[PDB]
């Protein structure tokens, strides 16, 4: 009964919540893009409430040694992060209808970002784990200028509404995207400053927050109209 398992069990219930509200509402719309938001935005809430699930259950956990000790990494939420992380951008995507190159460029850098996040989050060698934090990170400024500078302008040929959600959801994307690689830096993958139960209560309300706080605000909007 580890010490993080209590909020490893408040992100299966907000997840696996947010999956079935979001699930009802998408069965009940009929309008064919609406539906296309909706089964992407379930679909993200779904995978992270299994991997959660996962772990409250002991997967997707591994030590690694480093700094003199047995490190507890979690290794289930790359795998929840690989797929998630790219369907909210395409979410984002579609709604401003950012064209084939952008997005494919965005996925790209998304992979780029959560394997050589893993890869750090592995590795033995206790600098090196900076080295492939830093390149994750690079990654990950990449895909939030692209959001920022390149979507935000394409949404200029959009509706009011429709700009006007994208802000939204673009704000929020940029507060939170921009916390994980500093929870991660001071946490269990990198300093070991803070300790596994809070650092696992910080990813929960961010995981959370960039999933089903993002899904309701994106799904409740007209803007997903097409
Ligand atoms: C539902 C999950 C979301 C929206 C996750 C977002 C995750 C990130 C923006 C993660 C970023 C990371 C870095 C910038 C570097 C270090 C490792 C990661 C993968 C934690």
Do not use: H
């Not at 997967?59 to 990494?73: A, D, K, R």
């Not at 959801?169 to 990198?190: D, F, H, K, M």
């Amino acid at each position: 009964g580890r010490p993080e398992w209590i909020w490893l069990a408040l992100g299966t219930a907000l997840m696996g919540l947010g999956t079935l509200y979001f699930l009802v509402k998408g069965m009940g719309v009929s309008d064919p893009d609406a539906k296309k938001f909706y089964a992407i935005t379930t679909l993200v809430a779904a995978i992270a409430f299994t991997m959660y699930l996962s772990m409250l259950l002991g997967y997707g956990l591994t030590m690694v040694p480093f700094g003199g000790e047995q490190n507890p990494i979690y290794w289930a939420r790359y795998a929840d992060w690989l797929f998630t992380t790219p369907l909210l951008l395409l979410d984002l995507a579609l709604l401003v209808d950012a064209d084939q190159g952008t997005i494919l460029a965005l996925v790209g850098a998304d992979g780029i970002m959560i394997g050589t996040g893993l890869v750090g989050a592995l590795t033995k060698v206790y600098s090196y784990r900076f080295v492939w934090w830093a390149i994750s990170t690079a990654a990950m400024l990449y895909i939030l200028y692209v959001l920022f500078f390149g979507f935000t302008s394409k949404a200029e040929s959009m509706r009011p509404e429709v700009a006007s959600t994208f802000k939204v959801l673009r704000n929020v994307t940029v507060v939170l995207w921009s916390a994980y690689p500093v929870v991660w830096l001071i946490g269990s993958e990198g300093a070991g400053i803070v300790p596994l139960n809070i650092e696992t209560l910080l990813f929960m309300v961010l995981d959370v927050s960039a999933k089903v706080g993002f899904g309701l605000i994106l799904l409740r909007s007209r803007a997903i109209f097409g």
